[PDB]
Amino acid sequence: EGREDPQLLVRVRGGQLRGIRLKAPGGPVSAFLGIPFAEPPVGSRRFMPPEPKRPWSGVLDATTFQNVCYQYVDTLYPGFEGTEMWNPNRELSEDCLYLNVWTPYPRPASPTPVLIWIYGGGFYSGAASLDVYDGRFLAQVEGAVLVSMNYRVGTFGFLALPGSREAPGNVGLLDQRLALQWVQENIAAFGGDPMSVTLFGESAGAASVGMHILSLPSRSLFHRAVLQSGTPNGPWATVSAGEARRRATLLARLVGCPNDTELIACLRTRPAQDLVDHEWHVLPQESIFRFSFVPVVDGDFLSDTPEALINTGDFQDLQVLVGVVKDEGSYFLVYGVPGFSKDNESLISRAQFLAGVRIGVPQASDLAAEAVVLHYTDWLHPEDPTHLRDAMSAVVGDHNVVCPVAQLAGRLAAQGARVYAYIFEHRASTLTWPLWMGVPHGYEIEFIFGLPLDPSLNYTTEERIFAQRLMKYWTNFARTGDPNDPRDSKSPQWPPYTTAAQQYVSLNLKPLEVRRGLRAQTCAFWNRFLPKLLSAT
Amino acid sequence: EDPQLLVRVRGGQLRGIRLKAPGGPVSAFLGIPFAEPPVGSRRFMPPEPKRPWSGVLDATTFQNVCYQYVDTLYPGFEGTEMWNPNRELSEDCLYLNVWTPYPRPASPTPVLIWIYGGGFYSGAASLDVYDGRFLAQVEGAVLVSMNYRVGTFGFLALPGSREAPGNVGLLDQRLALQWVQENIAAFGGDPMSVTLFGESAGAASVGMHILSLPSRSLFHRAVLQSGTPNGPWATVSAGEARRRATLLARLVGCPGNDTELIACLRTRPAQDLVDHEWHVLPQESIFRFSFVPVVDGDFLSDTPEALINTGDFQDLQVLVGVVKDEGSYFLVYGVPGFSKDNESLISRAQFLAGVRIGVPQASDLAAEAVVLHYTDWLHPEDPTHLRDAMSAVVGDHNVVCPVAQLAGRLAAQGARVYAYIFEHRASTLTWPLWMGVPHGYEIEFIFGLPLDPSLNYTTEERIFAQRLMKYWTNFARTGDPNDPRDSKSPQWPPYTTAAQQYVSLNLKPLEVRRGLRAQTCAFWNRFLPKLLSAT
């Protein structure tokens, strides 16, 4: 070794690691990037569950982010920062099961609460190595141990022939689990407390957190959970065994493949890009907010549907922070609803609205679609292009995030959980999306990871203090199971969401504001009425 | 004897009576017959013009009330008895009443003609709240109210039969209108300026006079308060009218052959028919009536919905409106949990139970939709919100949303519409606080009753009453509720499909609101139909 920084050499079950000393605005942090936690799921291991990483020789260099799991690359607005920032920033490869660790520098004296991050990207995209998931700010400012993983996505993560040995489904979720076990065994070598692991994720990642809450084997690997704008229940996060089998079979046909063994084997001999190229082609209806290859109800990882499981399971032992952004849906409109674009005000007609509702709610019968339309129409101004545009966004937002989240907060709370809830209402001054999209899906993340503290990012000063507040919320929660600062009860208190009072707080530049009822009336429509209506057509 | 009280009409001579209003005398002519008594073999038949008479006919008292059910829900209680008949009951009831200034009007004066409510099963023009002396004395108006046959006697129908063809209660009204044309000029009334106005079943009657071509030459303007011809209660198909008449006949112990069926029904004391009146409804209901106008293809060429959807109303002027709490009055007449004597706090169970009764015709799924829409999900079980939501369901379903639909279709197809909501609860009111401003309690004020000192109304209620009296009569003179002399805004603007503007009648100055329960009425008018039509 000799001449290395001796605070960056660490040993884990797989061997020795050299990390890197990174600059954060307030001082240095330790980073161990590209730690392999599974055997590269390639060749005959494609579609298969992850195997633990076989131990290596020598010091593994862990100073750079590793490959991004093979995935679709968004080309809606090429070069535009707003979409490009989600796009993969390392090489695409099937060899991609690696995780990252940030810690204080030097590494902490006594055992430190751990935060594990699970990225979203609709189960078809995403990586732990994007700028918005930079653990350096949490680690430096809050002294946290931050961990984030890659997990397989798209076909490679979630293609399934349910019941088969060679493609049992959900292997991307099993990737996430393996990382959680890895954390248990190795995080104490970094000064992390493996008896205080808080998961947190966004969209698809929030959904993943949810499925770990609902899968028995995972529940012993963490103690608290944060779900940001995403749920295991709801219309997009899961599929039946039946529907997964249909999509898997169609994709096989689409790329050349005619018994499940035979079929899987031929899929294994296809180049990854040939699978990615045809991935969007197996959806049942012209839709938005629907993703082809997602977690499946197999009766194993998920013993029943998430709706069933939250309707029944016990949750006294659980502490959970959940919330949403103001304008969840607007982001998704430009990927399919005719009339929407980042480049104009997206003022649509009533006829574009009706057509939009059929796309936003692809599984709705004619009657149900009319019900949605009748509910979201403003009958004072039923043709006002502004009111229609905003209503369309609200339809997609409410159906896919806000009412699943409200139903989740509702069910958990009643069943013993300590639930804390927020709506995130601040539009980043640095936002590149148009004003009409409001506070769009995914743009709370930048503040929780604390990017505004990077002087060079041109955020405002009040935005700096704001990000500081959230980091305190998330970490206080992670430390205690409670967002509120213990010593600081002069500032307004964040109360738990109860079924009786349905309280939640506003997250904005102003101090905490307690609100009652989480879009209560409109979610009665989506959660109580609509399923009865589809179940009578 | 007094020459002002001496009027000659086509049929002969009348003696009226001089009455004291608080500010001066009025001339009243009460008990004027406009039709041959529909008794005996002429029961169920259309009315016929009154034969001429000798001598001077005494018209100084109210005549008999059309034979009808008498309410017994709260015996002795003013709140229900004030609707009960205040003269003897008879089938011999086709008589009308006329109030004019004293002395008689020098110039042809605009005429207001009033058509009572009572669900087409009750009512009389002699009720104290329909007293036309105040409008006559104060606004110098000529005011005319009629009786018309109600219940079985006015609306029992064996459609397509000679003997019980339906709608004769409406035809009674129409003959009274033909009478006003022919005779009102002798009282100083202007037959070229006749305004109809009525409440609930009366408002619906008015509605049906608008939608029936023969009536359209008998009036020029219309006021519909708290009722509409469209909606779930004011009409029945020919199929269902035939059903109820057949059934009532078997209950009364009759029988095929329409003729043989209506013949035996004619040989029955009136009470034997009224006794079984409520027993022919198809489901357990509230705000549903056994014998009402029928879509017979004659008086009503097609259904009221269909007719308002296609008619041309280009030179029509209409004043429509509701009270704040339409449904509350009706809850105590059959929804478990509700009462004049409690504060009617109800459980969620009782609320789901009441919706099946509020909306008797609804499928399982449709009632599920009602409950889910009216529940307050911040407070899903709070007995007060549930009670207030029950009242709102009945109100909205039966009055407010029919009104919004009519107001919309009329304005859209040429008509000039003025819309209101009445939000003042009478200080003299005998019903409990929880019912708020119940169905029926604007009439006291439109007719000017607060101007009588002995009624013990408050000073401001006297002042409010005068305002309403002036809206209504101004409307009668011009087709426009607004004073042409006061120069102070706000003004009462026309209801339009675009702006959906209406106003609030209460003690405070006029206030213009937009959207008459727009979101909720979309549910009832647009969605709910598509839903029953898929179960």
Ligand SMILES: CCNC(=O)c1ccc(C)c([N+](=O)[O-])c1
């Ligand atoms: C040209 C092909 N691309 C898509 O279909 C696509 C990409 C991204 C997203 C989020 C969605 N979506 O919301 O359904 C669709």
Ligand SMILES: CCNC(=O)c1ccc(C)c([N+](=O)[O-])c1
């Ligand atoms: C005991 C018999 N009485 C009735 O059925 C009745 C009387 C009045 C009213 C308004 C109603 N209603 O609401 O249908 C019913």
Ligand SMILES: *[C@@H]1O[C@H](CO)[C@@H](O)[C@H](O)[C@H]1NC(C)=O
């Ligand atoms: C916005 O742009 C898209 C595509 O460029 C177009 O289809 C849509 O009609 C436009 N809308 C407006 C209001 O200009």
Ligand SMILES: *[C@@H]1O[C@H](CO)[C@@H](O)[C@H](O)[C@H]1NC(C)=O
């Ligand atoms: C921040 O502002 C400076 C101008 O002072 C500019 O050169 C730089 O590119 C900006 N950076 C970002 C990320 O906006």
Ligand SMILES: *[C@@H]1O[C@H](CO)[C@@H](O)[C@H](O)[C@H]1NC(C)=O
């Ligand atoms: C209201 O009072 C009546 C009078 O007997 C009673 O039957 C009814 O049960 C009462 N309802 C409630 C909710 O107290």
